[PDB]
Amino acid sequence: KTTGFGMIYDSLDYAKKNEPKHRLARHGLYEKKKTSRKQRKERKNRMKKVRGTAKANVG
Amino acid sequence: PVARSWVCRKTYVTPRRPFEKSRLDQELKLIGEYGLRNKREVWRVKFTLAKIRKAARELLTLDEKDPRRLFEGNALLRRLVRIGVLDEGKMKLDYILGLKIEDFLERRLQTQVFKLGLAKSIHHARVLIRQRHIRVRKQVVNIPSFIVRLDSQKHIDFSLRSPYGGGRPGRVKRKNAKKG
Amino acid sequence: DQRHRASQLRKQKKEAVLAEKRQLGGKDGPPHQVLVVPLHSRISLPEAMQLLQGTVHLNELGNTQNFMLLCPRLKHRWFFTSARPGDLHVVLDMAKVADTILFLLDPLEGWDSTGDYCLSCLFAQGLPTYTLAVQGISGLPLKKQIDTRKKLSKAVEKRFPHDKLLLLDTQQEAGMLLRQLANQKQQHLAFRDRRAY
Amino acid sequence: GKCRGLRTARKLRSHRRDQKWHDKQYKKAHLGTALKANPFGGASHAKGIVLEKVGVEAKQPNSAIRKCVRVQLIKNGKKITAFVPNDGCLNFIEENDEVLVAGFGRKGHAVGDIPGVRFKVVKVANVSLLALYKGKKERPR
Amino acid sequence: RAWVLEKKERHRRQGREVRPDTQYTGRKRKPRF
RNA sequence: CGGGGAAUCAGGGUUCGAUUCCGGAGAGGGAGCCUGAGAAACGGCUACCACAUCCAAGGAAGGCAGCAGGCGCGCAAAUUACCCACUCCCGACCCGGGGAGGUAGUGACGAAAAAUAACAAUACAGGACUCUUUCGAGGCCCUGUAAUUGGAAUGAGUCCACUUUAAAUCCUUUAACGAGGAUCCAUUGGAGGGCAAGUCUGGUGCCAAUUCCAGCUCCAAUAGCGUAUAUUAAAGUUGCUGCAGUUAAAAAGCUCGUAGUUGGAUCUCUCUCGGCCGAAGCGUUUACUUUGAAAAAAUU
């Protein structure tokens, strides 16, 4: 025997709104950006040493 | 802070005197008679029996119409009847002090597999249970120390995917049949 | 008064230890000499030397390349030498002057028979401070990698029982290894410290 | 005769406090100056530097000449002498080596054979003597 | 070895059963670590 | 640091609680503040003290008892990994962020389950039962041991796939391969004085006894077993339960000599105002005992 949990949604729009992003991704209905935490954290900490539109100039 | 439990028990007590001939011979008798692995299993059953007897004695010190005595004595007697140790007619607290280690050792799954005729010996029973050949009511059991209840006694059958049961032959018989 | 006494003794010990650690590799001392020995025939020594090489003064000989490395980022001076096991006089000499011995390993086995032989000779002569590094762990598929290190721990635990295994794949691990070599407790050898060499 | 009033609690516990102080184990454990005089400093083991090798003569009715090593403890500088299991295991120990030394075994008491040796050598050069004796490991120098 | 010889003699005068006295009476089995 | 609590437990006690829950305190040592509902805040500022970083020598900047990581200390303790999917928190917010937290890694701290073989024939050895006074006979059984055979069963592993999950790993589920010296080989200690266990062997020296070393045989526990140190129990060697003080450790030179501890016998419910009741004085005060409320979880 195998035991799991199941959810049948009324429409695909409700399934796209109320489901977690990972279960939508397992069906291929969602894709997430291919960056890690370290890159985002270091870029955010670099962006706070520069003022104004130069904040958008990091990379 | 973590979301983890740190509650655990030891299931046995090492004897206070390590070397005496009487206890060594009694434990060797029990191990040979029930096909056990080490002295630790004998001590584990001793510890359960000692806990049950201590609870029964502390209940026996209570007044005869204590609500705790009635409730918890009925619960303890009902459990001891349910696992097949006490008879349904000996449901009295005093009889609990008359129980031996051998009853709890009979109610194990290894002994019940040997006594029901599924195995040619007690060591054959232990090997059969450990090798996923034995099931209880639908459920494949790998634990020789699985204490069989009275209502599970008539439902020990022999594992529908096992070679001697449903019929797919094992590794050895399939390999030999391909040689010739 | 007890707290004050403890503070005084701790200040003494910490200043003495600071002086001892400040001597080696710094501007008032000799370069830190590091001898690199691959313990297996499967190790590519020149690419590891590329990884270890901050400015490099690349001195070289007829077959060996021994290079000085200056790094004022960490304020440390190295002399990196190399020796192949089985060259008995070469490994024994450049290990009897080395302050550090960097052993190189392959991910599969610990060492060959030749590496075992040179390790027996080095244990016999006397070991200075040593550091274990594994070279090709990231060339294996990821599914086995963790288990591989686990297995190689057994392959190390016989001769190096309580010692960590560092990795040498990229420049980042090279910098981390250089940091581990720079700040580390030094084994002091009686024969070579009683006599000037 | 001991007092047995219903209001003699203070007197009973004050007397018990003082007569507790008249016990050697209680006073050793509660005076502080035993851990302030133990070479191990309250510890079960301690590391040291082998100063030299000395020889201790055994008891009078059974003459023997046992071999010990004089070592100096790292953390507090005290000098102790430590026992080696046999004469072969003495060859693995050299002057100016790092050694890990434990007690001789009976919670702090001396040997009933070898007079006045208190400690035994467990590890030398960060490897055990038992492994070195049995050929399980080699030691570095 | 002389000690265990005297103790076996002491147990003999106390009249209790004792092992036979042989070559291996007082003998170190092995080094103790 | 205190408490909830842990260990031992006949009963009383004894020992431990730095440590995830609660309360407190601090953020290198002191001190003074700004802002704010709330801070004497340090992942805020300002000085002094102690350390210490860059420098063009004018200056500028500092606070891991956060998560990792390093040095030092030592007997003594893990990755400079992945993620906001779970639990929750914060914000202007259904959407952003969170080394809180979660998930992997290291991990014989410790606790639970549990492999390292099973059966059949044959050959010997014992024990029953039938027939014989017995010896003996049992294609009569049972039980052991095998340098003896025999195929049956299986996990440890190798490895498709699914499942797992944020993505994975592990477990669970399943293909294929996978066991005879089933070498796919269980260790750790102790024993020839006493608790379990020896009338044994071989080297090496002193004057047959006798130092040192290697073994064999046996015993115990077993995926665990030694050792050291502390502590508890044995222990009634701290004695309240429950020790002693002639001769063993111990009663004061002796009596008057306040506090503290202990102290002989005795003593057999109602008054006013509102609907037989409610309010009121309690009846000398207590101690003691029983009942009831109230008192965090987790732990037991």
- Distances, alpha carbon A32 to alpha carbons A20, A37, A39, A58, in Å: 13, 13, 15, 22
Give pairs for B140-147: CB < 8 Å, separation 24+: B141/B109, B143/B109, B144/B108, B144/B109, B144/B110, B145/B41, B145/B108, B145/B109, B145/B110, B146/B108, B146/B109, B147/B83, B147/B104, B147/B107, B147/B108, B147/B109
Closest approach of D46 to chain E, Cα-based (Å) = 16
If one counts the domains in chain D, the total is: 1
One-letter-per-residue 3-state SS of chain C: CHHHHHHHHHHHHHHHHHHHHHHCCCCCCCCEEEEEEECCCCCCHHHHHHHHCCEEEEEECCCCEEEEEEECCCCEEEEEEECCCCCHHHHHHHHHCCCEEEEEECCCCCCCHHHHHHHHHHHHHCCCEEEEEECCHHHCCHHHHHHHHHHHHHHHHCCCCCCCEEECCCHHHHHHHHHHHHCCCCCCCHHHHHCCC
Residues 6+ apart with CB under 8 A from C46: none
* Closest-lying nucleotide for C13 based on CA to C1': F72
Instruction: Residue C153: name the closest of C177, C132, C123 by CA.
Output: C132
Q: What is the β-pairing status of strands D79-83 and D119-124?
A: parallel
H/E run at residue D118: none
One-letter-per-residue 3-state SS of E1-33: CHHHHHHHHHHHHCCCCCCCCCCCCCCCCCCCC
Dihedral sign (CA D37, D38, D42, D48): positive
Q: Report yes or no on B162 lying in a domain.
A: yes
C–D: how many Cβ contacts below 8 A? 21
Instruction: Determine C/D contact with 3+ CB pairs under 8 A as the test.
Output: yes
Phi/psi-derived region of residue D135, left when phi > 0, alpha when psi is between -120 and 50, beta in every other case:
left
Residues of E in contact with D58 (CB under 8 A): none
Cβ atoms of D80 and D73 within 8 Å: the answer is yes
If one counts the domains in chain B, the total is: 1
Euclidean distance between the first and the last CA atom of chain E, given in angstroms as a whole number: 21
Distance in angstroms (rounded) separating the CA atoms of residues C73 and C70: 9
Q: In this complex, do C120 and D138 lie within 8 Å of one another by their Cβ atoms?
A: yes
H/E run at residue D136: none
Instruction: Residue D68: name the closest of D137, D118, D108 by CA.
Output: D118
Distance in angstroms (rounded) separating the CA atoms of residues C76 and C182: 7
Q: Name the residue range of residue B110's domain.
A: 18-180
* Closest-lying nucleotide for C176 based on CA to C1': F80
**Å from B120 (CA) to F143 (C1')?**
15
Distance in angstroms (rounded) separating the CA atoms of residues D100 and D45: 7
- Distances, alpha carbon C56 to alpha carbons C28, C50, C68, C173, in Å: 20, 11, 6, 18
Q: What is the β-pairing status of strands C100-105 and C129-134?
A: parallel
**Å from D6 (CA) to F267 (C1')?**
27
Method of determination?
A: cryo-EM
Burial class (CB in 10 A: 0-12, 13-18, 19+), D38: middle
- Go through chain D and tell me how many residues it has: 141
Instruction: Residue D48: name the closest of D86, D6, D76, D16 by CA.
Output: D76
Instruction: Residue C64: name the closest of C42, C41, C98, C36 by CA.
Output: C36
Q: Please tell me whether residue D32 adopts helix, strand or coil conformation.
A: coil
Distance in angstroms (rounded) separating the CA atoms of residues D119 and B125: 53
Instruction: Residue C109: name the closest of C152, C144, C147, C45 by CA.
Output: C152
Q: In this complex, do C159 and D137 lie within 8 Å of one another by their Cβ atoms?
A: yes
Q: What secondary structure letter does DSSP report for B148?
A: P
Instruction: Residue C125: name the closest of C191, C170, C76, C173 by CA.
Output: C191
Distance in angstroms (rounded) separating the CA atoms of residues D29 and D24: 9
Instruction: Residue C57: name the closest of C37, C80, C27 by CA.
Output: C80
Residues of E in contact with D85 (CB under 8 A): 31-33
Distance in angstroms (rounded) separating the CA atoms of residues B93 and B38: 31
Place of tokens 């206890």: B23
Tell if C17 CB is < 7 Å from nucleic strand F: yes
* Chain B window 108-127, residues with Cβ within 7 A of nucleic strand F: 120-121, 123-124, 126-127
Cβ atoms of C130 and C100 within 8 Å: the answer is yes
Distance in angstroms (rounded) separating the CA atoms of residues D127 and D129: 7
Q: What tokens does C80 get? A: 């990196």
Q: What secondary structure letter does DSSP report for B157?
A: E
The one-letter amino acid code at A40 reads R
Cβ atoms of B131 and B137 within 8 Å: the answer is no
Distance in angstroms (rounded) separating the CA atoms of residues D32 and C34: 48
Cβ atoms of B111 and B33 within 8 Å: the answer is no
Q: What secondary structure letter does DSSP report for A54?
A: G
Q: How many CB atoms lie within 10 A of CB D55?
A: 8
The one-letter amino acid code at D39 reads P
Place of tokens 């729009």: A13
C165 - beta bridge partners?
C132
| Any D CB within 8 A of E30 CB | no
* Closest-lying nucleotide for B42 based on CA to C1': F221
Q: Which ranges of chain B does DSSP label H, i.e. alpha helix?
A: 21-34, 39-60, 67-82, 93-96, 101-106, 109-115, 122-130, 171-179
Cβ atoms of C71 and C31 within 8 Å: the answer is no
Place of tokens 């070469």: C90
Q: Name the residue range of residue D124's domain.
A: 1-141
H/E run at residue A42: helix A37-47
Residues 6+ apart with CB under 8 A from B135: B141, B156, B157, B158, B159, B160
H/E run at residue B36: none
Instruction: Residue C61: name the closest of C83, C76, C77 by CA.
Output: C83
Buried-exposed string C57-72: b where 16+ CB fall within 10 A, e elsewhere: eeeeeeeeebbebebe
H/E run at residue D70: strand D65-73
Q: Report yes or no on B126 lying in a domain.
A: yes
Q: In this complex, do D85 and E32 lie within 8 Å of one another by their Cβ atoms?
A: yes
Q: Report yes or no on B24 lying in a domain.
A: yes
Q: What tokens does C115 get? A: 């590496």
| Chain C interface residues (partner D, CB cutoff 8 A) | 120, 122-127, 158-159, 161-162, 189-190
Q: Report yes or no on B137 lying in a domain.
A: yes
Cβ atoms of D72 and D48 within 8 Å: the answer is yes
**Å from E2 (CA) to F276 (C1')?**
104
Cβ atoms of C132 and C160 within 8 Å: the answer is yes
Q: What secondary structure letter does DSSP report for B27?
A: H
Rg (CA), chain A: 19
Distance in angstroms (rounded) separating the CA atoms of residues B132 and B150: 22
- Which residue in C126, C158, C161 is closest to D141 by CB distance? C126
- Distances, alpha carbon A33 to alpha carbons A25, A36, A37, A55, in Å: 12, 9, 11, 21
Q: How many CB atoms lie within 10 A of CB C168?
A: 22
Q: Report yes or no on B11 lying in a domain.
A: no
Q: What tokens does D138 get? A: 């080699």
Cβ atoms of D84 and D93 within 8 Å: the answer is yes
Place of tokens 């720079």: C182
C102 - beta bridge partners?
C36, C131
Query: DSSP letters along B101-141, please?
Result: HHHHHHTBHHHHHHHTTSSSSHHHHHHHHHTT--EETTEE-
Burial class (CB in 10 A: 0-12, 13-18, 19+), C36: buried
Burial class (CB in 10 A: 0-12, 13-18, 19+), D134: exposed
- Go through chain A and tell me how many residues it has: 59
Residues 6+ apart with CB under 8 A from B30: B36, B42, B101, B102, B105
Distance in angstroms (rounded) separating the CA atoms of residues A36 and C54: 29
